[PDB]
Design a protein around this nucleic acid. Structure first.
Length: 460
DNA sequence: AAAAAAAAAAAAA
């Protein structure tokens, strides 16, 4: 039986590699989005070598004392999730999960000796993201669903802003809200939904990409902008030379002249230039599309003239530029050359994408999981990848301090001393102070800021 | 099975 697993994290900060999770929530459902089984909710105990981002806490209303009280350790946290995620024929999804939540999962698994990717493909599993779905439905097939406007008068695709606009900040509350919004797009606009669902697989999306012929495609993405209904026509120039999942798209709705005039070396420097300091010179209308990140791509005619007129996209302008691009192969020679160019971090936590782990290293990490916390140091394993030891020490020191001998306790105590420096704690203290002014007339916020300081004391 | 961080806009804590 195929299933849908709607999830959402509530974390202590924006960096999934560097910030710890506070709460996880998830519900199992079926093809028609009907609840299977009971809702899964649990909290993660943050280790004693970390302090949360206050801004992230203020948003959540979840203190470290709460998570520490109600929750379990990150190794168990990583287990309970991996158990739910391993279940075969499961499609794991949420609201903007690919850009964030997934990245958490990957790290959590990476830090706790679980494979960081298997869950997204093994045993007929998959992942999906309902952000660009909502962004598509509005831009292509808006009938039947209400769309917010704000004081700016542009479409807001914030979950809370969508639920309230159609009559519907807790982790579990966000999941339901995600389901309701799925149901809402399914029931009202099922023909689009299914298309977006079946084309979540990069291997499917491939079918749309005819690079030599440069077949124009309808791309929906935030990076375009709300004023364009997050939508435009794009023509694939070429595959990314090093990265295989990336493909180089040229925006047909935009000034192409920079591509013809300026040479690669220039176009590059021009590509990575801020909009502020960029004067009268036009920006390079080129973006990468990452097929493995579930990007919305469809064929031109999916975007109908009337919709292009509603959104404000001069079809003709897109049709012209394509003729010129097809007329100027040298543009492809110029563009690809941009992306063929070649400052890593020391912190093992941040070394996820350094490379895949070998099979041998994999098995050993399966043995590390099997072996009891106390019996790990005795387990004289010969690893190949240098990250695994550093991961293993931190894994033990964070989740099972009781297993540490005096030297390891000293080495850890040093590591904590290197993190919690007087100036870091001063910066944190004044960051906390500032905020307590900024929300001076908010007792709920203050009470938290006091808990952050109280936490910032006792743990060091 | 992957690509963080020049920057594009807008969603996530």
């Amino acid at each position: 039986q195929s299933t849908f697993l709607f999830h959402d994290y509530e974390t202590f900060g924006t960096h999934p590699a560097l910030d710890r999770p506070a709460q996880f929530a998830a519900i199992r459902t079926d093809s028609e989005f009907n609840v299977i089984g009971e809702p899964e909710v649990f909290y993660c105990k943050p280790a004693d070598d970390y302090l949360p981002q206050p801004g992230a806490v203020l948003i959540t209303g979840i203190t470290p004392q709460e998570a520490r009280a109600k929750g379990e350790n990150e190794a168990a946290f990583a287990a309970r999730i991996h158990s739910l995620f391993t279940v075969p024929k499961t499609c794991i999804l949420g609201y903007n999960n690919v850009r964030f939540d997934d990245e958490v999962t990957r790290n959590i698994f990476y830090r706790n000796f679980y494979d960081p990717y298997a869950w997204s493909w093994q045993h007929d599993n998959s992942r999906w993201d309902l952000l660009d779905v909502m962004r598509a439905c509005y831009a292509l097939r808006p009938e039947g669903i209400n769309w917010p406007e704000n004081d700016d008068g542009l479409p807001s695709f914030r979950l809370e802003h969508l639920t309230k606009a159609n009559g519907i900040h807790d982790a579990m509350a966000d999941v339901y809200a995600t389901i309701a919004m799925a149901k809402l797009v399914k029931t009202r606009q099922p023909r689009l939904f299914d298309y977006l669902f079946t084309h979540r697989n990069k291997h499917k999306l491939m079918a749309l990409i005819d690079v030599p012929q440069m077949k124009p495609l309808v791309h929906v993405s935030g990076m375009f902008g709300a004023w364009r209904g997050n939508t435009s026509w794009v023509a694939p120039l070429a595959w990314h030379p090093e990265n295989r999942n990336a493909v180089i798209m040229v925006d047909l709705a935009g000034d192409i002249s920079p591509l013809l005039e300026l040479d690669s070396d220039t176009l590059r420097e021009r590509l990575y230039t801020a909009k502020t300091d960029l004067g009268d010179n036009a920006a390079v209308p080129v973006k990468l599309v990452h097929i493995n990140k579930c990007p919305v791509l469809a064929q031109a005619n999916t975007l109908r003239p009337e919709d292009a007129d509603r959104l404000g996209i001069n079809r003709q302008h897109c049709l012209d530029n394509l003729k010129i691009l097809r007329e100027n192969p040298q543009v492809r020679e110029k563009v690809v050359a941009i992306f063929a160019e070649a400052t890593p971090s020391d912190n093992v936590d941040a070394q996820l994408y350094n490379g895949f782990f070998s099979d041998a290293d994999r098995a050993a990490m399966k043995i590390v999981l099997e072996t009891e916390p106390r019996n790990l140091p005795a387990l004289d394993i010969t690893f190949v990848d240098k990250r695994i030891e550093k991961l293993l020490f931190n894994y033990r020191a964070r989740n099972f301090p009781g297993t540490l001998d005096y030297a390891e306790q000293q080495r850890w105590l040093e590591h904590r001393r290197q993190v919690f420096t007087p100036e870091f704690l001063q910066g944190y203290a004044d960051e906390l102070q500032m905020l307590v002014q900024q929300y001076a007339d908010d007792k709920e916020k203050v009470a938290l800021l006091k808990a952050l300081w109280q936490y910032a004391e006792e743990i060091v």
